[PDB]
């Protein structure tokens, strides 16, 4: 039902602008706070700051007031968080969150934006073939990160996904699967792999 | 700013016992409307945080009971009973007496449990990659306790460690163990040149010939 679908992330050159987007819905968006929150690759989070529902009230994280604006359309159902001089201290997970505090409390999926001189680069993709345990092995892709699921998220027991590996500008993964014998070769097994940065949608079937 | 203050791991926690999680706050979090206003959320891996308690006395809704928390205004405790193995992940405090919110660095709960040795898989390149010029070769280790384990790679008997990448997973929300898997990247001609691939944990050894 309460959904806040996130998009306007990907990668950016140091110096430039960017606006994220939170789309609300299940909800009377007009009639609570939205806030920002942003965690780094591997690290805690930051607020950034909030936003009441007539938008006459905006708060910010004070070293962050120059370089982030946050505004909503009540009319779209929608919240956004414009940035501007962005550096590679940018670089985040970017979470839209409701009434934070409170019974209300809800945070989005969040949307990566990487501050990066470098070229997104789409992955290559592996089978990863011999209970039994099968995988696909994920290579060569910028910036962060890729998805991997198995029949499209079907399949979640025995997944165990590894975080990712940068090496030499470039990031790699795997993630293997173990099921019942007599469920494969017998039955499909799939991993679909997204990277969201080049817009690659890419499914491998597991073969013998 | 206030500055919320904790640990980055709790202490290892065995399941079915009591988990305590300490954080500390540079002002005082009550107010003099008697509330004190702190926060703890839970992120679980691959999810975004989710809260556990606000303001000290109240729960989430589908948080259970499980979870307490409490404290003299600038120093506190979240009391996790029965620990069960799906509350794996980091315990986050955080306030807003005063803006901005602010949160502490987060708390990785730690489960105790029994050693487990992995059971470990080797996947020799797939044949669509041998185009590439490379070959990769991938060791996984599954479902092990504790997390420090060592892999070795070995092509002919001989060890190898260039072209090596390795990387873990979580502790696992249902089982708290841990899987790990490790990657041999080589040419094509180097992977072609030799026959016997080896990796081992530490003593379970997996190999094949090519």
């Known amino acids: 039902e309460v959904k806040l679908l996130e998009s306007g992330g990907g990668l950016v050159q140091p110096g430039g602008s960017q606006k994220l987007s939170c789309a609300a819905s299940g909800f009377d968006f007009s009639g609570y706070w939205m806030s920002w929150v942003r965690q780094a690759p591997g690290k805690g989070l930051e607020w950034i700051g909030e936003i009441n529902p007539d938008s006459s009230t905006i708060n910010y994280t004070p070293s962050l007031k120059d370089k982030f604006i946050i505004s909503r359309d009540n009319a779209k159902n929608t919240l956004y968080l414009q940035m501007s001089k962005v550096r590679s201290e940018d670089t985040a997970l970017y979470y839209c969150?409701?009434?934070?505090?409170?019974?209300?409390?809800?945070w989005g999926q969040g949307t990566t934006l990487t501050v990066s001189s470098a070229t997104t680069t789409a992955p290559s993709v592996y089978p990863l073939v011999p209970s039994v345990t099968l995988g696909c092995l994920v290579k060569g892709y910028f910036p962060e990160p890729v998805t991997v699921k198995w029949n499209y998220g079907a399949l979640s027991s025995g997944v165990r996904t590894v975080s990712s590996v940068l090496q030499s500008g470039f990031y790699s993964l795997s993630s293997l699967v173990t099921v019942p014998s007599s469920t494969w070769p017998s039955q499909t097994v799939i991993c679909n792999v997204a990277h969201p940065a080049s817009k690659t949608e890419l499914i491998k079937r597991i073969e013998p | 700013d206030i500055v919320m203050t904790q640990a980055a791991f709790s202490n290892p926690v065995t399941l079915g016992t009591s988990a305590s999680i300490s954080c500390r706050s540079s002002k005082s979090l009550l107010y003099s409307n008697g509330i004190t206003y702190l926060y703890w959320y839970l992120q679980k891996p691959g999810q975004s945080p989710q809260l556990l308690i606000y303001?000290?006395?109240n729960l989430a809704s589908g948080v259970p009971d499980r979870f307490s928390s409490s404290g003299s205004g600038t120093d506190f405790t979240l009391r996790i009973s029965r620990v069960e193995a799906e509350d794996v992940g980091v315990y986050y405090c955080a306030q807003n007496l005063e803006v901005p919110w602010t949160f502490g660095g987060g708390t990785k709960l730690e489960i105790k449990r029994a050693d487990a040795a992995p059971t470990v898989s080797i996947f020799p390149p797939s044949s669509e990659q041998l185009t590439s010029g490379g070959a990769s070769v991938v060791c996984f280790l599954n479902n092990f306790y504790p997390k420090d384990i060592n892999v070795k790679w070995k092509i002919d008997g001989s060890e190898r460690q260039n072209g090596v990448l390795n990387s873990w997973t979580d502790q696992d929300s249902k089982d708290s163990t841990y899987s790990m898997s490790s990657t041999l990247t080589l040419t094509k001609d180097e992977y072609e040149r030799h026959n016997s691939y080896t990796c081992e944990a530490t003593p379970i050894v997996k190999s094949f010939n090519r």
């Open positions: 969150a409701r009434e934070t505090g409170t019974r209300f409390d809800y």
């Open positions: 303001q000290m006395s």
